[PDB]
Amino acid sequence: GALSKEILEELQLNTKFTEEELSSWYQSFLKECPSGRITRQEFQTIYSKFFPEADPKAYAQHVFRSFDANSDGTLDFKEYVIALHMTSAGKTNQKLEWAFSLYDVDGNGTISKNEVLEIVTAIFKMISPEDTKHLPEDENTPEKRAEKIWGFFGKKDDDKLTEKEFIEGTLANKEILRLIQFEPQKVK
């Protein structure tokens, strides 16, 4: 097929390849995935291959789920391309609403204390133990990282974090941005 003028428009406001190039990638994608769909197991394998120093299965599953809040089924080429952009390219502040969808594990519209710990833990496993030693003491375990996040938002244990407030805080408080950071290369 051809990449629809519509998906190209979709992709080019959310990422950066070009129209023709995304078609080129698409034609190759179709050769390898004839149905134009990729399963969660297939998507996980991409992360397994390219993060040999890490244990990225949980992270990849959460990233996959951010495009349905469902684990079964598939992604299409558009979601697959956007997923790779989110994890690996561009600047974080252009990604804040997607970050919210990542952290809202159950997709119920708000973020809970446990959901922060789940995603923080998954991201934490993307970092080698070599790199883990260079992290500051008060931010070197998933529990410390996740509790610092929850405290930066002024939250009690049973509170619910809205998208409005998540965007505000990730924009304003650069310590929050550092702690919620989901691109493995940027978790320094």
Binding stretches for Ca ion (CB under 5 A)? 104, 106, 108
- Closest separation in Å from C-beta 160 to Ca ion: 8
Q: Determine if residue 68 is labeled as part of a ligand binding site.
A: yes
Half-sphere exposure (CA, 13 Å, Cβ side) for 165? 14
Q: Determine if residue 157 is labeled as part of a ligand binding site.
A: no
The 3-state DSSP composition of the chain as helix, strand, coil percent (nearest 5) reads 65, 5, 35
Q: Determine if residue 70 is labeled as part of a ligand binding site.
A: yes
Q: Residue 104 or 147: which CB sits closer to Ca ion?
A: 104
Q: Residue 93 or 108: which CB sits closer to Ca ion?
A: 108
- Closest separation in Å from C-beta 178 to Ca ion: 22
Q: Say how many Å lie between the first and final Cα of the chain, rounded.
A: 41
Element containing residue 46 per DSSP (H, E): helix 40-50
Count helices and strands (H / E) in the chain: 11, 2
Rounded Cα distance, 64 and 44, in Å: 8
Q: Residue 47 or 166: which CB sits closer to Ca ion?
A: 166
Q: Which residue numbers belong to the known binding site for Ca(2+)?
A: 68, 70, 72, 74, 79, 104, 106, 108, 110, 115
Q: Which residue numbers belong to the known binding site?
A: 68, 70, 72, 74, 79, 104, 106, 108, 110, 115
